[PDB]
Design a protein around this ligand. Structure first.
Ligand code: 6V3
Length: 292
């Protein structure tokens, strides 16, 4: 695909906006467009940068972060800046946190599935994310458009990780489906998966390996529960494909209007077998029965 070689003189570096496993991400400008640049900080890091650059060049989708180009001196990636920050931050970040709706929760999960389904349907060889979680989901367009990315890990992903991955089996693209199942629960409940557990990360791995999943949700539509709990399955072959998730979720959006309303209202918080959803399903059930 069309990957621009870039002159660092033309980039107007403004400020640091967090960082990944390697490198430091900075907000900048470049030919009158807001850009996130991921600059390298030691000559040692170039092998990983090449894999990242070769990956980002292949992918071209509305729900995966767009690489504009890369400067080879000094070595940096140049991506479209996502103003909204991570989904992790919108859900769990610093107060004041934004209000959002079941429609938003479903639209984020739909958009994420669309992006992963694109990765999975790629040729000659299918790409697998293997680290799908809200810190790697960026928001744009007032919190309404979600973009998959990967900040990378050094050596916290345990909560969203499929059991077959962390147990050192042969994993497949069905590990992404597991992760998505957990993200869906997370955006619906606005709870971090496994804070009831806590302690070090191997506690979560152990828990999940013995069958522990997140708790079920009071008054969750049976169809959404069916989908969610299939994605949690120990056996990877019993989880749906992303093609299937995208089709289902696309169709459920009929009963979840208002996903294009930007996040703009504030929210104040409390936390109680089951758990209450943060979002409200009254309107879903209302719209559903009108059809059925
Ligand atoms: C085995 N692989 C697993 C993952 N793979 C990947 C799949 C899809 C996207 C990927 C993006 C990458 N790169 C990437 O997204 N880097 C990156 C992420 C965030 C970032 O920071 C921002 C970018 C834009 N707006 C921002 N606003 C605040 C930070 C920020 C800078 C670089 C790296 C890998 C990717 C394929 C197979």
């Amino acid at each position: 695909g069309p990957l621009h070689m870039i002159d660092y003189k033309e980039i107007e570096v403004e400020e640091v906006v967090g960082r990944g496993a390697f490198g430091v991400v900075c907000k900048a400008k470049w030919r009158a467009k807001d850009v996130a640049i991921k600059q390298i900080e030691s000559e040692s890091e170039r092998k990983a940068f090449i894999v990242e650059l070769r990956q980002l060049s292949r992918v071209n989708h509305p729900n995966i972060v767009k690489l504009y180009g890369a400067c080879l001196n000094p070595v940096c990636l140049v991506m479209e800046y996502a103003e909204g920050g991570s989904l992790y931050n919108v859900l769990h970040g610093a107060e004041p946190l934004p209000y959002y709706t079941a429609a938003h929760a479903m639209s984020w999960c739909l958009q994420c599935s669309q992006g992963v389904a694109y990765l999975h349907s790629m040729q000659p060889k299918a790409l697998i994310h293997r680290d799908l979680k809200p810190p790697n989901l960026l928001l744009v367009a007032g919190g309404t458009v979600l973009k998959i990315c990967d900040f990378g890990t050094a050596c916290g992903s345990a909560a969203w990780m499929a059991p077959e991955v962390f147990e050192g089996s042969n994993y497949s693209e069905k590990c992404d489906v597991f992760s998505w199942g957990i993200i869906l629960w997370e955006v619906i409940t606005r709870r971090k998966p496994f804070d009831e557990i806590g302690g070090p990360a191997f506690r979560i791995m152990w828990a999940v390996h013995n069958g522990t999943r997140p708790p079920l949700i009071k008054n969750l539509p049976k169809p959404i529960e069916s989908l969610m709990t299939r994605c949690w399955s120990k056996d990877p072959s019993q989880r749906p494909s992303m093609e299937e998730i995208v089709k289902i979720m696309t169709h459920l959006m009929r009963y979840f209007p208002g996903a294009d309303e930007p996040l703009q209202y504030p929210c104040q918080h409390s936390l109680p077998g089951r758990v209450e959803p943060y979002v409200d399903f009254a309107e879903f059930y209302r719209l559903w029965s009108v059809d059925h």
